[PDB]
């Protein structure tokens, strides 16, 4: 169905991955939470 | 020194062009202009 | 890792076959000087075209 793509090392040189989807994909708190990077990309 | 283009040239008294290549090498390579051999980055320090 | 496997590989024939029928000019006929920006196409370290 073309949902997820198997990926290897050589291939990774060419792509730009996201840590967590909800984290990052939608363009847009506890003090005890670890500080997390932005979705500029 | 008054010149903005620091340019220096020379000529000599088969094909001379090749010795020049040998000749211009040594010039660049082995002619120190000052300072002792093997010594670079005279680094100050207090 | 947990989520890793290994390519057990295959034949590359059908692949080559495709590009053949798909504009990958044969190498032999490559004339760079006039086609400056051809993208080289490699397979398994074999620069086919």
């Amino acid at each position: 169905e073309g949902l997820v793509e198997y990926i290897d090392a050589e291939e990774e040189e060419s792509i730009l991955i996201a840590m967590q989807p909800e984290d990052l994909e939608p363009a847009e708190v506890d003090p005890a939470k670890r500080i997390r990077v932005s979705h500029h990309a | 020194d008054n010149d903005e283009k620091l340019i220096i040239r020379c000529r000599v008294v088969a094909e001379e062009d090749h010795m020049l290549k040998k000749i211009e090498n040594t010039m660049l390579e082995n002619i120190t202009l000052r300072g002792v051999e093997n010594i670079e980055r005279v680094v100050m320090m207090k | 890792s947990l989520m890793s496997c290994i390519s057990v590989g295959t034949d590359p024939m059908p692949i080559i076959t495709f590009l053949s029928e798909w504009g990958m000019e044969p190498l032999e006929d490559y004339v760079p000087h006039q086609s400056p920006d051809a993208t080289r196409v490699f397979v398994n370290g074999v620069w086919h075209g």
């Binding site: - | - | 044969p26 190498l27 032999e28 006929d29």
Partner: protein, 148 residues
């Protein structure tokens, strides 16, 4: 902040034009005949052998038992045909080698006397190169000289 599993309870609950005809050429002539394709590297615009030179002469230039290695016939046949093809005058000269890259999928449209055509498969192609034109050769004369 916990591990919850029975959501199977949830999930099972939550659930102009000009015609030009063709003809596959008769086969007997092909059966008797071998034809192939010339290619030159002269970088000359056409290099017509007409304007090349005359004449033209193109041609190739009891014990016990034992083990023989195995090869398919066409390879043995073509390997055997290692004598490079050479056309001459008796003045310039041309020789080539086989290419094996583009002899498969190749049929030619002979522009016959008619606007029609015939289609002819390709047997071989060759790449004749001019040679000896400035005629310098030092077979071992520069070789032994080389080591200098």
């Amino acid at each position: 902040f916990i591990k919850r599993d029975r959501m199977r309870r949830n999930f099972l609950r939550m659930r102009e034009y000009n015609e030009f005809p063709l003809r596959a050429i008769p086969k007997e002539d092909l059966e008797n005949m071998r034809t192939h394709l010339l290619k030159f590297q002269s970088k000359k615009k056409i290099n017509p052998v007409t304007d090349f030179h005359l004449p033209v002469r193109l041609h190739r230039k009891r014990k016990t038992r034992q083990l023989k290695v195995l090869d398919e016939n066409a390879k043995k046949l073509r390997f055997e045909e290692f004598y490079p093809w050479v056309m001459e005058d008796f003045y310039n000269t041309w020789v080539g080698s086989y290419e094996a890259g583009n002899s498969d999928s190749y049929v030619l449209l002979s522009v016959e006397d008619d606007g029609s055509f015939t289609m002819i498969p390709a047997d071989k192609v060759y790449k004749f190169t001019a040679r000896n034109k400035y005629a310098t050769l030092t077979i071992d004369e520069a070789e032994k000289r080389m080591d200098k």
